[PDB]
Ligand binder design. Structure first.
Ligand code: NA
Ligand code: NA
Ligand code: NA
Ligand code: NA
Ligand SMILES: [Zn+2]
Ligand SMILES: [Zn+2]
Ligand SMILES: [Zn+2]
Ligand SMILES: [Zn+2]
Ligand SMILES: [Zn+2]
Ligand SMILES: [Zn+2]
Lengths: 267, 267, 267, 267, 267, 267
C-alpha cells in the first residue's frame, strides 16, 4: 500500500481488494444463521420477511431470544409469569410461519437483560455449538433507542461473535468439547438507521404482518391501530432506498470496521 | 396505510394523523410536570427560564434531584457531607425564585448514580404517586457529555416513564396502593444538541442567571468569569434558532420514536 | 458577554478569549503526559508517531495500560496467563523504540475492564502521583467501536481527569499525602472520527509500523496482510486533513465542552 | 448498674428489668404479623401450625414471598414460567387453609434472590405500609443451610426491620406518604437450630401436612416418602423441648442482642 | 412416621431407613469424583492422601480449580501472570503424583472468585458433562476461615451440586445437549472442623508432603519451616479421632440436611 | 515434627515454638496500631478503654472509619448529610479524650459498605502508607451480628491485612512508591464472643462511657437508659474472665489459624 497516492484510493483498495468486501449478495452462501432478538417478536418485526426468504432458500434459521417478555402487558390481571408462558407460544406459532424450527430461550427477565461477561458466555456456548455462517442482531447504535434490552442485545451479540473465536474466552466450553466459533461468518444488524443492504419484502409484507400479529398479547386492536402504519412506514423507509415499496434494512461491514475505524460512515 | 404511495407521505400521515405530533405548543395542556436533574442546579441551568414561565402560567413544577452534589467543590475545607447540606439549601432558594415548591431528593451520591433497576424503581414510585402530565430530563445522547450522572439520569428517566406504565414492573408499588403511571402526555429533553422546540427566555435571562448564582458553592466569582459567558453563549445558540436573543432548547418526539425507529432525524 | 450581538461572535470570543482555546500548538509546554491504552499495543497503534515526536522533544511519556491482553490469541496451546506475560515484554520493547520509560499496568483482564468507581480510583491515584500536563485516551464516542474495553477506557479517562481534581473524590489519596490533580492540563482523544488536530507522521510511519509489529503475538503474517493496509489507510485518512501522506488525529476541546454543551460539533 | 456485683447478676437485671424480656407469651398482643418466606411453601413448612393458631386468635397474617419458585421442578417439560404460575395458585390454596388473606409477591427469581439495598427497600415499603406488630423470617444462622435464598431472606428481613425505622433509609417512601416503621414490634426466626420459644402444634399437625401437600408441584408421592418423615422428625425435635409430640420452634431475642452482643447463647 | 414414640427414635429411623445414611464406607461405590479446589494446591493439601487412595483403588479423580493462584507470592520479581503459568505446571506435576490426569481450570483470578450465578453455571456445566458419583469441596462453615475464595468455593460447590439437577437452571446447557446432573451419590467436605469420616493417610503422609512441596512457588524452605509442622499437626488432629497417626477429615451428611435442618449436629 | 507423639504435644509446640504465639503481652512493642471501625463510635464502644491504655503507653493509635454514620437517627428533620457532618465532629471529640490524633474516613454510606475488592484496596493503601504494628477490627464471626457493615468490616480488615502483603495485589500502590505491608504485625478482633485476651478497663469504665456519650446524636437519654446497662453488662462479661469488674475482650490467633485450620477453638 506504501505506493498509493490518496486516502480515497487507499480506502477503495482496502475495502475491495484487501478486505474483499461487497454487498452484492451477502447472505448467498449461508447454510445456518442465528437471529438474536431482545424480546419475543423482535426477529419477525425487524426481519420477518428476510427470515422467510432465508428459509425458502434452504437456510436453517435459529432464533436466540434474550428475554422472556415478562413485562409486556398493561393488563393488571396477567402476571409476568403468565405472560412469559403465553409469549413462548406466540413466538413458536410466529416462527412456524417463517420456517424457523429451533429457538434458544435465554430466559433473562424483560427489562433486566444484564450487560455482562455472563451473558456473552451464554451467546458464546450457542455460537460454539451451532457454528452459524451468519448472525443477525439489533444495531446498538440506533439513535434514540431507549430500551436497554435492545442496546445490550446488539452490543453483546457483536462482542460475543468476536470473543467466542478466542480459546481463552469462556474456556470451560472447550474443556467440555465445543470448539471456538469458526471465522469467516458475517454479522448483519437490523433495526438500523444506517442500512447498507436492503431486502425487498414487498410481496412478503402481508405474511410478515400476519406473523407479527400472532404475538396477540402485544398487538390487540387498539395498539395495532398505531403499529400497523408505523411498521408499514418503516418498511417504506427501507424499501425506498433501493426503489421498492417495502424493504428490510441491514447494516453490514468488514470485521475490522467494528474497531478503531474513523471512516465507518463511508459504507 | 396499505394504499399510500411514497415513504414521504406515509411519514407525514404517521406523524400528523396516527401520532398527532405537534411542536407548536407542546406544553399547552400541562398542569403538573417533573423536572428531573442529575445534580442540584441542573434544572435551573438547563431550563430555569422555562420553569419560571411554567410556574407563572399555573403549572405545578416538581423537581426530582437524583444525586446530592457531594463532589462539587475544590475547597479542601468542605467535606462532601457539608457540601451536600449546603447545596440542599441553595437548591431550595433557587427553586423558590422560579415558582417551585417541591423537590424529591433521591440522595444518590454525586459521581455514583447507579444505572440500575433500583434507580428506575425510585423514579417509578414518584411517577406513579404524582402522575405528572410531562417529564423533563437531560438528553442522554448529547455528544461528548462526559458526566455519567447526566447520561444515566437521561436514560433512566426515559426508561422509567415507559416502564412505570407496566403493572408487572416494580409490582410492590401496586400492592401498596399506587397505580401505574398513565397520565403523561410528554417527555422533553433539555441539555440537547438536537432541539426541535425552543422557548424564548430573553426577558427571563437575568433572573435565570440570578437563580443559578444562588448556587454559590458552585459559582464563586472566579468560576463565574467562565460560566457566565458559557451560559450566555448556550442561550444564544438556542435562541438564534427561532431568531431571539436567549433561548432554551428541548427535544420532543412521539413515544414510538424512542424505539426501533430509523428516521428519528426527520423531526 | 451581556452586549455581544450574534451567537457566531459569542462563540468565537468564548473559545479564543474566555477559554483561551488553542489548536495551533496544543502540546507546547507539555513536560509529562500519560497515554492511557485499553490493551498492550493501543498507544502505539493509535498514536505511536506522536509519542515518538513527544519523546524526541524531551517530553516524558508514561503509559497506563488498562488490561493485560489475556484474550488476544487464537492459539489453543497458549493460555491467557502465558500470553499476558508475552505481551508485557512486547510492550516494553515497543515502548523503548518510542522513547517511553514507564508503564503503569492496571492488570484488569482483557475483555473484562469494569466501568466503575474503582477503576476511576486507580486512574486518579496515578493522575495525582504523576501530575501530568496532558492525557491521551481513546474517544469513547467513536461510531461502531465494538470493544467494551475501548469505550470504557475513553469514558473512565475523561471522568478521572475531571474527578481527580476534586478533594472529596477518592479522598484516601489525599489522606496518604497525594494532592488533587492539577488544573492546567489538556485531554487529547485518539482513535477518533472527529479529529481537530493532526500530527504529521509521514516520516515516522515505518517506525510506527515496526513498533506495532513488535507485538508479534498480535500480528503474525496472515493478520498483518490485512492490518498493514488498514493502518496505512487510517493514517492517510488523518494525513489528508493537513495535506500530508500519513497523520495521527486527535480530538481536543476546552474542558467545559465535555459537559452540557450543544455545539461541540463546531470544533 | 454501677453497683451490681457479678456479670451473672447484671445479665439477669439487663434481660429482665432493663430490656423487659420474657418469652412467656411473646405473640400475645399481636394484631398483624408478616410471615416472610424465601419460596412458596416456606411459611407453611416452617410455621404453618403457628400461622393457623395466630389466625384463630384473630391476628391478621400476611405473607411476603421473596421469590417465584421458578426452579423447583425436575420435570423437563415444565418451564420456570409455568411452574411459577402453578406455585402462585398452590400458595393461595395453602394460605386459605391457614386463614391468610394477603400475600406480597416480590417476584425475585428462585436461586437468584439478591442480597442488596434494593431488596431491603422492597421489604421496607411493605413494613412501612402495613406497620405489623411482628415479623417472622428464617434464622440465617442455621448451620449448614445451603440455600442462598434462605440465608439472604433471613438477613434482609432482620436488616429491613431495623433500617425501615430510620427516616433517612429509602427516604422516597416518606416523600410519597409512608411513615417509618413503628418501634416495639418483635422478630421471631423460624427454621432455627437454637429455638427458645416453642408452639405446640400436635393437634394441628395433620392440617399443617395437608397445607404443605397442597404445594403438589413440590411434593409428589416419591418426594413425600422422604419429606413426610423428615417434617415429622423436625416437629418432634421442637416439640420434645417443651414435652409435647409436635412443635414449631422460634428464636426470639431483645433487639439489642442482634448487635455487638457476646452472650447471645445465654438465651 | 405417624406412630413413632420419641424424637430419638424418629431421628434414628430417618437416618438409617428413610435416608439410608452410612459413614462406614461412604466412598465405597465411586468410579468418578470431582475434587473442587479454590487454588492450585488445595486438593493435595486438604485431601492428597485420599486422592492417592482413590486413584489406587481405580477411581477417576478429576480436579476443578476455581482460580489461577495469581496473588500467591511475596516475590516482587514475579508478576501475577507469570506466577499463574508457573502454578499450572506445579499443579500438573503434583496431580501426576496422586493419580490425577484431568484438571478443569476455571481461571478466575485468585482473591477475586465471584459469588454468583455465573460461577454456579461453570460448575454446573462440568457436573452435567462429567456426571461424577461424588464431589469434594472445602467446608464453607469452617470457623475463622478468612479467605473468601475458600468460603465461596464451598458454598458454590454445594449449591451447584443441587441446582445442576434442575432443568430450568442454566437451561442453555440442556439446549446444547447436556443433561441435568443425576449421578451424584455424595458430597464430602474437606478442610472441616466437624468431620464425621476420617481417612487414615499415615503411610501416605510422606508422599502427600512431597506432592505439596511440588508447589515450589508456594513453599520455599523458609515458609516450609512453618507449614510442615502445621500440616503435620493438622493430620494428627484428624488421625487422632480414629486413633491413627495421620488422617484427613471429611464431613458428609444426607442431602436433606443441607436445608432447613435443625439437628445437623447429631451427625 | 516427624517424631512428635500426640496431637496435644504437636499443638503446644506449634503454638509456642514454631509460631511463637504469645497471649501474655500481645501488644508489647506496638508503636503504631490501626483501629478499624464500621461506624463513628465503634472503636470507643468496642475498645475505648484499651485505646486509652495504648495512648497512655505512647502507642500511636489511628482510626480507620469505614462509613459515615449517615443513617443513625430517627429525627425526621435531620438529613443524613447533616447527621454525617455532626458525627464526624463527635468522633473527633471522642477520639481526643482517648488520645487519638488521626482518623481515616473512608466515607462509604452507612448501611451500604460494599464487600468488594475496591474496599480492600482502600484498606490496603492505608496499611501500606502507615505500616502499623497491629490492627483491631470487629470479629465477623460474632453470632447474631445483624449489621452488614459490622460483618463486612471484620472480613475486609482480616483479608486486607493478608493481601496487602502481596505485591501483585493492588499493584498500583507499589507503582506510586508504597511498599507491601510489613509482615510482623498482629490482628486483634473486638466485639467477640470468643475472646482469648482481656484488657482490664475497671478504672477506665467511666472515661469509656463518657467518650461513648460524646456521640450525642446516637445516645439521647432514652436510648442511654438501655445502652448504659448494656455496655456495663458486656464489660462485665469480659472482665469476669480475668477476675475484674469490667474488661474489653479480644480474639488473637497466629496468622496461619485464619486459614484451613480445624482446631481454632483450642485457643
Ligand atoms: Na459454515
Ligand atoms: Na505541569
Ligand atoms: Na400495632
Ligand atoms: Na513496626
Ligand atoms: Zn424488543
Ligand atoms: Zn449536573
Ligand atoms: Zn485495544
Ligand atoms: Zn425455601
Ligand atoms: Zn487455597
Ligand atoms: Zn457500628
Amino acid at each position: 500500500f506504501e505506493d498509493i497516492d490518496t486516502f480515497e484510493e487507499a480506502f477503495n483498495k482496502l475495502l475491495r481488494e484487501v478486505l474483499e468486501f461487497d454487498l452484492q449478495n451477502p447472505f448467498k452462501d449461508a447454510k445456518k444463521v442465528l437471529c438474536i432478538e431482545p424480546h419475543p417478536d423482535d426477529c419477525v418485526i425487524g426481519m420477518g420477511g428476510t427470515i422467510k426468504k432465508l428459509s425458502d432458500m434452504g437456510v436453517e434459521v435459529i432464533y436466540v431470544c434474550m428475554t422472556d417478555g415478562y413485562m409486556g402487558t398493561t393488563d393488571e390481571s396477567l402476571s409476568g409469569h403468565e405472560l412469559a408462558a403465553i409469549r413462548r407460544k406466540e413466538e413458536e406459532e410466529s416462527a412456524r410461519l417463517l420456517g424457523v424450527k429451533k429457538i434458544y430461550w435465554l430466559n433473562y427477565r424483560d427489562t433486566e437483560l444484564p450487560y455482562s461477561r455472563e451473558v456473552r458466555k451464554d451467546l458464546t456456548k450457542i455460537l460454539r455449538k451451532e457454528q452459524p455462517d451468519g448472525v443477525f442482531a439489533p444495531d446498538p447504535w440506533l439513535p434514540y433507542e431507549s430500551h436497554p434490552d435492545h442496546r445490550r442485545t446488539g452490543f453483546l451479540a457483536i462482542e460475543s461473535v468476536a470473543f467466542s473465536q478466542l480459546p481463552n474466552f469462556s474456556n470451560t466450553d472447550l474443556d467440555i468439547g465445543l470448539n471456538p466459533y469458526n471465522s469467516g461468518s458475517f454479522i448483519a444488524l437490523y433495526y438500523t438507521h444506517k442500512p447498507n443492504y436492503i431486502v425487498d419484502i414487498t410481496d412478503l409484507m402481508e405474511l410478515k404482518l400476519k406473523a407479527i400479529r400472532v404475538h396477540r398479547s402485544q398487538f390487540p386492536d387498539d395498539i395495532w391501530e398505531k403499529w400497523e402504519p408505523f411498521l408499514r412506514t418503516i418498511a417504506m423507509f427501507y424499501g425506498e432506498k433501493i426503489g421498492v415499496r417495502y424493504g428490510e434494512g441491514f447494516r453490514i461491514m468488514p470485521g475490522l470496521f467494528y474497531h478503531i475505524t474513523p471512516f465507518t460512515d463511508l459504507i
